[PDB]
Design a protein around this ligand. Structure first.
Ligand SMILES: Nc1nc2c(ncn2[C@@H]2O[C@H](CO)[C@@H](O)[C@H]2O)c(=O)[nH]1
Ligand code: NI
Ligand code: NI
Ligand code: NI
Length: 331
């Protein structure tokens, strides 16, 4: 209201203490065009905003295996005071590291840690985005059969699967959803053989929810589509990022086209940048569980190459999820 006792201070003597933020990444890698890449793009954007460069204020530790999680988190604790575990698999390793270094701040993305003051947890309503992808798929199938390729069987991927199945059923319960898990988020070759089998059995759309494994699903669809006419093409649904650019191909008939129907979005990069800024300002949300959903645009659907009829079904289904009229199952 008033500040009568005051002293003039030079801007040269006032300074804001910066933080150093690192992500510890799973097998998928920061080049997975999806989940880990979104996180890494977010951290790079944050680095650029704070005048930093890789291994000088921000970095990523790629995990070779589960045994490398603890090694990478301990290496990170040498130089970084905000450490993100990217993926549900880092749950136990982040719990242990947070108990050893109570002075550092940790974030688990895609899972919850309870009762740890220096750990924040982030989850996404991927069931809600999955539902929208299902409505999209149900409005474009000609064969009335669609594929789902998961990475590792988990509460997280079951959220996508349940939402996707529910969204397909909301339009046409006649449609068959073939489900297959790769057992990995970093196995393109297994993604390719699963997609090959799903397409050969008469799926005309595959939704890939397996991070970097999904590069194989894109490779299979591209090979089938290059050896066919444009109007007989087979679709993939993108995940985490808008993957439209990965769908570029040329048909047997010489026509330039795109086989990405739609992508589910998961704003992991946005979350990494926002929490990094809060940690640097001394407002780290330790002990809290942050839930992103359709409402706050933490998840969404990019409607890329969907028919106008499909976009209407998606916009209508989105309204019903926001209003509460449709409750999307999580399992
Ligand atoms: N634990 C883990 N989950 C991943 C990874 N890549 C992708 N995912 C999950 O799979 C979904 C589809 O890529 C993402 O939204 C994440 O939930 C990874 O490397 N590790
Ligand atoms: Ni005042
Ligand atoms: Ni004074
Ligand atoms: Ni800074």
């Amino acid at each position: 209201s008033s500040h009568h006792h005051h002293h003039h201070m030079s801007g040269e003597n006032l300074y804001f203490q910066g933080a150093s933020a690192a992500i510890v990444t799973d097998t998928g890698g920061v080049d997975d065009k999806s989940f880990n890449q979104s996180a890494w793009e977010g951290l790079q954007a944050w680095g650029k905003e704070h005048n930093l460069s890789k291994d000088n204020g921000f970095t990523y530790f790629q995990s070779t295996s589960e045994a490398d999680y603890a090694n990478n988190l301990q290496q990170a604790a040498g130089s970084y005071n905000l450490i993100f575990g990217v993926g549900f698999a880092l749950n136990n390793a982040v719990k242990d590291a947070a108990k050893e270094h109570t002075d550092l701040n940790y974030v688990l993305i895609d899972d919850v840690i309870k009762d740890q003051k220096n750990v924040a947890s982030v989850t996404f309503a991927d069931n809600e985005s999955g539902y929208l992808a299902g409505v999209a798929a149900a409005k474009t199938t000609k064969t009335k059969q669609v594929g789902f390729v998961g990475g590792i069987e988990s509460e997280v991927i079951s959220r996508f699967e349940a939402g996707f199945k529910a969204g397909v059923a909301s339009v046409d319960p006649s449609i068959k959803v073939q489900v297959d898990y790769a057992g990995s988020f970093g196995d393109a070759a297994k993604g390719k053989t699963i997609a090959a089998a799903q397409y050969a059995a008469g799926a005309d759309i595959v939704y890939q929810v397996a991070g970097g494994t999904g590069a194989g699903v894109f490779a299979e669809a591209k090979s089938l589509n290059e050896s066919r006419p444009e109007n007989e093409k087979v679709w993939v649904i993108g995940v985490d990022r808008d993957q439209e650019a990965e769908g570029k191909y040329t048909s047997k008939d010489g026509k330039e086209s795109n086989f990405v129907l739609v992508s589910t979005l998961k704003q992991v990069g946005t979350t990494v940048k926002d929490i990094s800024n809060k940690a640097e300002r001394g407002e780290f949300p330790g002990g809290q569980v942050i839930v992103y959903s359709l409402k706050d645009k933490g998840v969404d659907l990019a409607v890329t190459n969907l028919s106008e009829e499909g976009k209407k079904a998606v916009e209508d289904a989105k309204a019903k999820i926001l209003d509460g009229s449709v409750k999307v199952p999580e399992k």
